[PDB]
Amino acid sequence: MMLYIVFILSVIFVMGFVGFSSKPSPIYGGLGLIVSGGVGCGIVLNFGGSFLGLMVFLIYLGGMMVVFGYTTAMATEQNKAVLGAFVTGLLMEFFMVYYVLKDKEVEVVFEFNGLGDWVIYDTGDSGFFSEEAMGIAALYSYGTWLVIVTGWSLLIGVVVIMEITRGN
Amino acid sequence: MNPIIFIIILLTIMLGTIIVMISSHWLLVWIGFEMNMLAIIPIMMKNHNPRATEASTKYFLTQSTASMLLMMAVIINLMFSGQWTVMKLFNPMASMLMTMALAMKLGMAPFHFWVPEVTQGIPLSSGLILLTWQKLAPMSVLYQIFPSINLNLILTLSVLSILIGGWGGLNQTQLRKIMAYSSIAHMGWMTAVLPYNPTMTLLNLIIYIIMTSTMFTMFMANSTTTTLSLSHTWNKTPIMTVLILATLLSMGGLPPLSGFMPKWMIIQEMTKNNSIILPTFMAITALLNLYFYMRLTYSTTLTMFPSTNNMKMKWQFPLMKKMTFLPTMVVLSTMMLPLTPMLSVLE
Amino acid sequence: PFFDVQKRLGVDLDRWMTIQSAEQPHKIPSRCHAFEKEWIECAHGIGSIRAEKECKIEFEDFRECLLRQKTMKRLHAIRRQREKLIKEGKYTPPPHHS
Amino acid sequence: MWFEVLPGIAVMGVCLFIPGMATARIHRFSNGGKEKRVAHYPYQWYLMERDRRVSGVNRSYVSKGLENID
Amino acid sequence: MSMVYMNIMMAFTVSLVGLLMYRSHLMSSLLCLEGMMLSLFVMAALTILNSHFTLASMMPIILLVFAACEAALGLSLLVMVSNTYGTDYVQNLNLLQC
Amino acid sequence: AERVAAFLKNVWAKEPVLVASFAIAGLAVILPTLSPYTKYSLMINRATPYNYPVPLRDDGNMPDVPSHPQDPQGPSLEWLKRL
Amino acid sequence: SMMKWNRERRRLQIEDFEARIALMPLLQAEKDRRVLQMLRENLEEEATVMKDVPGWKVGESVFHTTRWVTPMMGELYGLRASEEVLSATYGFIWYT
Amino acid sequence: MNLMLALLTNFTLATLLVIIAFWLPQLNVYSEKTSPFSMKFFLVAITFLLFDLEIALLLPLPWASQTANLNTMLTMALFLIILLAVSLAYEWTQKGLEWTE
Amino acid sequence: MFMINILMLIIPILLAVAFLTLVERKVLGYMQLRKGPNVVGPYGLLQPIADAIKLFIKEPLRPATSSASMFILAPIMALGLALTMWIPLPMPYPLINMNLGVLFMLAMSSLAVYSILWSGWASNSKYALIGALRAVAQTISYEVTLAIILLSVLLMSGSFTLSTLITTQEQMWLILPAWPLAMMWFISTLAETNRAPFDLTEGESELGFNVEYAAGPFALFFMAEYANIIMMNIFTAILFLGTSHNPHMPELYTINFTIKSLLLTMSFLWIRASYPRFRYDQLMHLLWKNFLPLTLALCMWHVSLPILTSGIPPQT
Numbered sequence A: 001m002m003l004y005i006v007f008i009l010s011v012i013f014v015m016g017f018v019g020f021s022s023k024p025s026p027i028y029g030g031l032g033l034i035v036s037g038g039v040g041c042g043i044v045l046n047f048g049g050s051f052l053g054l055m056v057f058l059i060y061l062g063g064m065m066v067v068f069g070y071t072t073a074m075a076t077e078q079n080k081a082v083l084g085a086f087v088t089g090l091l092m093e094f095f096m097v098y099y100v101l102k103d104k105e106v107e108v109v110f111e112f113n114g115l116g117d118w119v120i121y122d123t124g125d126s127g128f129f130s131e132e133a134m135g136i137a138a139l140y141s142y143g144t145w146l147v148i149v150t151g152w153s154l155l156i157g158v159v160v161i162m163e164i165t166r167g168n
Numbered sequence B: 001m002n003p004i005i006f007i008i009i010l011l012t013i014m015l016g017t018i019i020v021m022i023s024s025h026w027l028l029v030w031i032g033f034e035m036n037m038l039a040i041i042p043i044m045m046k047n048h049n050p051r052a053t054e055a056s057t058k059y060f061l062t063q064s065t066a067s068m069l070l071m072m073a074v075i076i077n078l079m080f081s082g083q084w085t086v087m088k089l090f091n092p093m094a095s096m097l098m099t100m101a102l103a104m105k106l107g108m109a110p111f112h113f114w115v116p117e118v119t120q121g122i123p124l125s126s127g128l129i130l131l132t133w134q135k136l137a138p139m140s141v142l143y144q145i146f147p148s149i150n151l152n153l154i155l156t157l158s159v160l161s162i163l164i165g166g167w168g169g170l171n172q173t174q175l176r177k178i179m180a181y182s183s184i185a186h187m188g189w190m191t192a193v194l195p196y197n198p199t200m201t202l203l204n205l206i207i208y209i210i211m212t213s214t215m216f217t218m219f220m221a222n223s224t225t226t227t228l229s230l231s232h233t234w235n236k237t238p239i240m241t242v243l244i245l246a247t248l249l250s251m252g253g254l255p256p257l258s259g260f261m262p263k264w265m266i267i268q269e270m271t272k273n274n275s276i277i278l279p280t281f282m283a284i285t286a287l288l289n290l291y292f293y294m295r296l297t298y299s300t301t302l303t304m305f306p307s308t309n310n311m312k313m314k315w316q317f318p319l320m321k322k323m324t325f326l327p328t329m330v331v332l333s334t335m336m337l338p339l340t341p342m343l344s345v346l347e
Numbered sequence C: 001p002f003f004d005v006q007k008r009l010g011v012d013l014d015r016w017m018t019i020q021s022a023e024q025p026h027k028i029p030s031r032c033h034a035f036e037k038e039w040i041e042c043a044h045g046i047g048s049i050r051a052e053k054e055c056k057i058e059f060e061d062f063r064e065c066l067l068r069q070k071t072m073k074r075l076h077a078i079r080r081q082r083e084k085l086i087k088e089g090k091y092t093p094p095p096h097h098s
Numbered sequence D: 001m002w003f004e005v006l007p008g009i010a011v012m013g014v015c016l017f018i019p020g021m022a023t024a025r026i027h028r029f030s031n032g033g034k035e036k037r038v039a040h041y042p043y044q045w046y047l048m049e050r051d052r053r054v055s056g057v058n059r060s061y062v063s064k065g066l067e068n069i070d
Numbered sequence E: 001m002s003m004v005y006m007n008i009m010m011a012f013t014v015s016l017v018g019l020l021m022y023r024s025h026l027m028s029s030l031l032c033l034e035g036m037m038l039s040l041f042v043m044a045a046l047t048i049l050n051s052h053f054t055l056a057s058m059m060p061i062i063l064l065v066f067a068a069c070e071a072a073l074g075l076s077l078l079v080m081v082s083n084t085y086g087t088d089y090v091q092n093l094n095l096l097q098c
Numbered sequence F: 001a002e003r004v005a006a007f008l009k010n011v012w013a014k015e016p017v018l019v020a021s022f023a024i025a026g027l028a029v030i031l032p033t034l035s036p037y038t039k040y041s042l043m044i045n046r047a048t049p050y051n052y053p054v055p056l057r058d059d060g061n062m063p064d065v066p067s068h069p070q071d072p073q074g075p076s077l078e079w080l081k082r083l
Numbered sequence G: 001s002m003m004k005w006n007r008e009r010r011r012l013q014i015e016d017f018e019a020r021i022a023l024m025p026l027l028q029a030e031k032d033r034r035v036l037q038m039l040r041e042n043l044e045e046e047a048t049v050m051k052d053v054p055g056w057k058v059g060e061s062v063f064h065t066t067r068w069v070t071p072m073m074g075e076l077y078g079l080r081a082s083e084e085v086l087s088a089t090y091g092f093i094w095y096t
Numbered sequence H: 001m002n003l004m005l006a007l008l009t010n011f012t013l014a015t016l017l018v019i020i021a022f023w024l025p026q027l028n029v030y031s032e033k034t035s036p037f038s039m040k041f042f043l044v045a046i047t048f049l050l051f052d053l054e055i056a057l058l059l060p061l062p063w064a065s066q067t068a069n070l071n072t073m074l075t076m077a078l079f080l081i082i083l084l085a086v087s088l089a090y091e092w093t094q095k096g097l098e099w100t101e
Numbered sequence I: 001m002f003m004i005n006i007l008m009l010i011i012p013i014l015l016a017v018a019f020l021t022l023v024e025r026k027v028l029g030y031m032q033l034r035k036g037p038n039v040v041g042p043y044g045l046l047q048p049i050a051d052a053i054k055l056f057i058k059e060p061l062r063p064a065t066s067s068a069s070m071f072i073l074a075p076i077m078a079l080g081l082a083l084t085m086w087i088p089l090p091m092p093y094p095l096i097n098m099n100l101g102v103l104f105m106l107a108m109s110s111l112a113v114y115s116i117l118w119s120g121w122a123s124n125s126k127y128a129l130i131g132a133l134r135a136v137a138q139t140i141s142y143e144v145t146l147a148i149i150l151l152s153v154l155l156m157s158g159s160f161t162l163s164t165l166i167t168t169q170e171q172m173w174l175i176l177p178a179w180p181l182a183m184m185w186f187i188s189t190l191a192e193t194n195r196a197p198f199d200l201t202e203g204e205s206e207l208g209f210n211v212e213y214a215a216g217p218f219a220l221f222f223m224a225e226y227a228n229i230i231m232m233n234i235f236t237a238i239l240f241l242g243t244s245h246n247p248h249m250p251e252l253y254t255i256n257f258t259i260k261s262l263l264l265t266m267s268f269l270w271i272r273a274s275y276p277r278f279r280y281d282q283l284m285h286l287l288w289k290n291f292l293p294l295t296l297a298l299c300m301w302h303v304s305l306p307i308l309t310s311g312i313p314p315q316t
């Protein structure tokens, strides 16, 4: 059952989404989105992306999601619909999991397969480097245009937010 | 707001739209949209009142959702073709989300409920940017991916926009809402001819921008935002009523004014493709636009509405508004029909 | 592009990351470099109306190397047949497959 | 006096020495008296797996020298 | 496609439906908006890593940087909505009907 | 000449931290242009052999390409052993 | 001091990298024979498993081209033990 | 598998201490006892987020120094850091980094 | 054997934290002209054990928390993450030999803010929330300088591998070429762990967030907090005071490396006894107006310095 680690994580990934998509109180909604983020990194790590997976923890979970929780505790004033949506979500997940595990082929918009994610991995690698790392480091040698527009947007984010929040 | 920061924010709105038009990569197209939405919110919040705050919120949620759908189309297109180039999409499901993402950004029906409300809650100058400049970026992408757009989807969004823009405008007294519904109606024409001749999509866009910019400029000169407040203009600036009459008649497509040229050329490019029912239905439904334009002509220029006593104090001061390019825009909005063959410069 | 500023100025703003058979750092190839190259060289210059018909063979191969749909159907068939014969006493896996 | 503070330091010092001493010894015990192989990059992993096939016994740390060559 | 893609692709659908059905809180919907980018982040990274599209390994980071900048702009509006009506309820934002 | 001294001696008294920050950042932007060893950084980076040196089919007219690694022809890393 | 030591470390990296280059030809030759053997081993089992199927060709390519295509994990370890498959798929990612 | 066991052990151990901490004294039987949004705090969080994102673009610098285009690489590296310092200056002069009303 | 390895790392950590409480109370005592614990066991060697038993058989409060599930999640997360930050530390051989270990420690360290934020919610007290917000704003502010300073140091090392820092310092400590960064790294670690002169949480007369906790749950927050004090000082010694590694005598490394890690942990106790406490607005200005301008400037200097001397480290 360790060969299907990626699929097991993806199932937990969806269940978390059904958690905060049903929209419980914001405190619990943010809690469910942290669980999905951690599971999301786990999936990316098992596909060979280590820098990308860790960037999720540092920037997404330890960054944005901290600001989300920080802003919730200060501007949120700490039902049947929630339970109804949550139960509806799990049932659809169960049936999708049930069928892809029975006949190993499901057609919903796209043709999905059920053999196992491991069957599409590359079979040959003998490099003395990390291919993912080389691509990201190319941001400075190849992505000159990307660096300029991204940096300017971040600078404008500082200017814009101060304008919006002044109130006068 | 500091004047220098106002220039910087505006140039970022332009830069976002320019990045979309010069990019051969879907990531830079998406970055262009994000830089555009980030910069335009501060000009909508500039007056610091609850209505502006509500308008900026409804705009953010709509444009944020539209951008997420667009990025989902790009990734699906990457999975099925292994490339990022800005061209025809290689999956029908990617095309639907891409076509629907752009429809939401444009404001086409039935993704239209935010255009009347956002345009109403922001100043006139912000509305002018929203209804003219913000339409360039989505139309640029449609110009490039039209070979793969679902015909029944693009023509269905076009027909609903023409209808909903027409009926919505009849029941309005606020000027900002009237232009918003007018903007929805003209979008349907631009996307109706897109599968057949994209050149006429640009011509109708160029003419619409010129005419719409003229109307907002004349409203801003007298600080008029309601039908009644516009009816005092005859007693303050008589010349400005004659210019409003001419532009309103132009927007309605009445010959021999400029606004008849796109309606004329779009009907031509659709009958060549044996499309007879749609152009007729489109042309007849456009009479709804001509009606509530004519209503403003009755209460502004063709009749003299009641005035107030304090108006006499206004006669002693001039107009200090900028009214930039107003003499040039008004002439281009009315006297360009004899130059119709010039559309070939757009090819 | 709507405006071809890059071609006019001869500046490569964003064309270096459009395709996966372009120049990569340290000459690292993509898994489907050969298939992408073949389709690109088939459809070059003839417009997309013709390429949709006269380069369909290359395109189907490229899409087979991307999503591997046909291969997974074939492996799935073999696994079922082996499983069916396994639960009848009619098959015997060799020592090096166990 | 000040030197009566040392006995607490010795206990705290010893507890921080066990984790380092234990890992070094356990690796050598489990790797036939050698350091545990370090495989950060794919090439190193490929060699280690190859060593597993060459050992006869399915163990990466059993090295075969010239005496295994004819 | 594959088995993992189904759940990632179904996680985007859940968040989209969650974003299109507001309950009361504005903060709740912003989470559904940041769930959408998380699913897109994972789905793109899976495609790029599996195909050895080396130069595209930087794209998911750019997706994360802009999506977080947009999220910051969203929270700022939520704060300014709460400083006016005393809560982040969407039903209060109904002045523009007329 | 006296205006600058008065200005510099005032920030050095009231804002020593900022004065240090700009001096350090200013050196990071200037020295690489004037440094004679910046060219050796590129040569070291180009000399590192991550990939395999695929050999070239011999046609006869290639006197600058060695037939064996230990032949004297081809690029030399002697400058690196002495750096 | 840092400049000197870093410079010595680059000369050491080249020496370590050149050892890999000197060995790649032997490792490439071994890998080619190991990949082909596993493909042939699967070919035999496919023939036995599907000798009586309604219209099945043994070892039929799914590509129109006749060019050599690198096998994926499913084609090599399709019918092997889970432990061997687990090592060849997640072994590197899970090592330490 | 090793990293998975390490995480399982640490959090499993922490849970045990927590539950036996809430129950061990409950093996005892003690008599039942019976019976504003701040704007500046929000701006600190947002300023951290925008700074934190810019750090994400700087983390791959050590690998970026291994390229053969050091002139281009060193130009963009100093551009990102300079832009990050420009954001700090803008907040500093616009009274963003203040705690007085 | 790996499972034995994990326990050989966890239990000694907790024992070290237990006797750090004693050492702290006695070093503080002698700097104050007194003794500290010397009655409970010889030289107070049984004082830590008495304190532990007392807390775990004392009745806990568990007030009417708004959730009652965050109240139990907060100490699990704090202690769970605190032990997890030790697994990649080379002493000299890591339990888990990560390629991006330095980045792993930043990632896990930035998650410790949730236990501060969650415990604020659970307390259900409006005032206790304000204290949690100030603590959270302090932690995120000072991990901006931790990330940039670490990046600057790694430019002289070449990788995020923690064991490569040992090779980098095989001829000389990094404290020599990068002492200005070491100063701002050392102070940034005090602010992260809410240590004097940066302990506003425990700094009564202005506020703490963990005020509603007593007995065992309180000890769990305490244990996690002190394990982070040892861990950050072990990180500092590896980063700036590299110890030479002899593969044949690994114990030699561990003894020298432990002595450095203790001396840096005692420096934390030394600094607590010597200075008064910062004001909240004053430690924020120490970061956004003094450290950050220098950290950004030194980052520019350290990106360019290796290039202009031809001293770029190897990638591997």
Ligand SMILES: CCCCCCCCCCCCCCCCCC(=O)OC[C@H](COP(=O)([O-])OCC[N+](C)(C)C)OC(=O)CCCCCCCCCCCCCCCCC
Pocket: F014, F015, F017, F020, F024, F027, I175, I180, I182, I183, I184, I186, I187, I197, I236, I240, I271, I286, I290, I291, I294, I301
């Ligand atoms: C050739 C190229 C060379 C390039 C590099 C050149 C570098 C030149 C030197 C630059 C200056 C060096 C930087 C030093 C850091 C300055 C930080 C700063 O902001 O200072 C002002 C700051 C505050 O300055 P301030 O409060 O006095 O005022 C600031 C400015 N005004 C007046 C406008 C407000 O000082 C502090 O950081 C306060 C310290 C808090 C208490 C810390 C307790 C110290 C305990 C002793 C620890 C000793 C270190 C142990 C290290 C162990 C490591 C293993």
Ligand SMILES: CCCCCCCCCCCCCCCCCC(=O)OC[C@H](COP(=O)(O)OCCN)OC(=O)CCCCCCCCCCCCCCCCC
Pocket: F011, F022, F023, F024, F025, F026, F027, F029, H082, H085, H086, H089, H093
């Ligand atoms: C070519 C590539 C590099 C291009 C870099 C271009 C971008 C630079 C980005 C810098 C970061 C943004 C900082 C900009 C803000 C400057 C400070 C400021 O805002 O001015 C405030 C100050 C207020 O004045 P006041 O307080 O009233 O009175 C005392 C003032 N001294 O008013 C003042 O009087 C301040 C005076 C202006 C500050 C000038 C700073 C110049 C820094 C360059 C120094 C380089 C020297 C390097 C050589 C060192 C050799 C040892």
